[PDB]
């Protein structure tokens, strides 16, 4: 019934901004009311993206595998297009002889 009425990362990055703006307003409003569970879990986020740079040496290990998988992926794509060119070339010969 929903389909009758009605008829990736880019959206996720916009969702991350919503969670960050909630923490920004929570710290500003906390200082105006002063000068516990949030501050306990906040320091654990920073210590668990400056820390991701230590694994960058080991991160590129599996990154080039994607390009290697994409290299053979693009080569196979030619076999689909070239075969269509050969198929269309045979269609042209059938129209001239007809």
């Amino acid at each position: 019934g929903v389909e009758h009425l009605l008829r990736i990362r880019l959206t996720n990055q916009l969702k991350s901004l919503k969670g960050l703006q909630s923490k920004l307003k929570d710290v500003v409003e906390y200082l105006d009311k002063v000068i516990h569970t949030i501050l306990g879990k906040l320091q654990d986020v920073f210590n668990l993206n400056n820390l991701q740079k230590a694994l960058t040496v080991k991160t590129n290990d599996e990154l080039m595998v994607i390009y290697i998988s994409n290299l053979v992926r693009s080569i196979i794509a030619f076999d689909d297009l070239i075969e269509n060119k050969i198929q269309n070339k045979k269609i042209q010969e059938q129209r001239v002889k007809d």
């Binding site: 290697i68 290299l71 080569i75 030619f78 070239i82 060119k85 070339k89």
Partner: protein, 400 residues
Amino acid sequence: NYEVSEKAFLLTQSKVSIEQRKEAAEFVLAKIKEEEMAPYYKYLCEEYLVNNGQSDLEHDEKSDSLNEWIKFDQELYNELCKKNESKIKELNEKIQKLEEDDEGELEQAQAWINLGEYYAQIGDKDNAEKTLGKSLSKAISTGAKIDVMLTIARLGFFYNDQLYVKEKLEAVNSMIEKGGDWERRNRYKTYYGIHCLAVRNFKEAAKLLVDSLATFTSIELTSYESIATYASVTGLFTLERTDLKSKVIDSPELLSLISTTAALQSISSLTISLYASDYASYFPYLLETYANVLIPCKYLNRHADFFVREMRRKVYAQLLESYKTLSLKSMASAFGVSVAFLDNDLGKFIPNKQLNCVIDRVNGIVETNRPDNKNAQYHLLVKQGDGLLTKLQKYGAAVR
């Protein structure tokens, strides 16, 4: 006709054991007189042109052979033409009876089968191939079709034909259904293995030669000791140390060859020294094998010294994995290698990335580099990928 092509090649270029030319020259003179082939006595003039150890003395006094006269004359030529004209008269008398009879497709093809043997034994090559094509279409089954390929392979091994013989070789193989036929298997694996020799495939050479059905030994083209000769040479490349102790050293076909033919010695001196990885014993057996194996064989001496470079590359990799750091003088007093000439021997590999050996010129020690990694393996895809994209752009722009 194995000794016919063998003794004819010994008279081409021989730098070792010139006494074998006498037994080779005396054999080819007595063989042609006892056979019907006219031109093969004349071909000795053109085939030996521009070769070391000339077997012909006319205008060239540099001939080192013991028998210096191969010269063609009309005395022997006229006698061989009499046997050719007398035999064709008997065959044409039978063929004329077959043409008037025409019983089945076997007798019609047998007329060309007797010719296919006749034109092959009188010295005709292209004229024999024209007669074999007629008997191929008139054959009643695949039994008479493979006999046509046998004559094609006979004229192809003497004249080194890699095109017409290879095409008809796979034609009998494919046909309609291959099956477990002995004739289409035993003969194919041996002949196609000979074609892989000249082109040096080494991928199918180890499987179709080192591993043979039983003895082969048709005696018409190649012999028993010849198949085992190339097996020892080709078995040192594709076959690793796992198969050397199974299909080479422990092979039952090579156990009785030591006590039979002692002139080879390529299944013992070369195999034991490589399996034990001892350079002291392996070095003096290189020239002893090079003289009595590579030189006399027709499909070897064409390359020769290149095999010495490749066979020595195998023993350098055996020692490289046995140590990390080693002094240069250690292998000198043990394995009997010259320190001054060691840099020149390893200088044909290391800069070409054939070996990981690294020698320190300061303290005179040799090191070991990384034998394999991920970076060196991706370099093969670069050259293979870039070479493939050339055909896509070439054939893509050609069709428009």
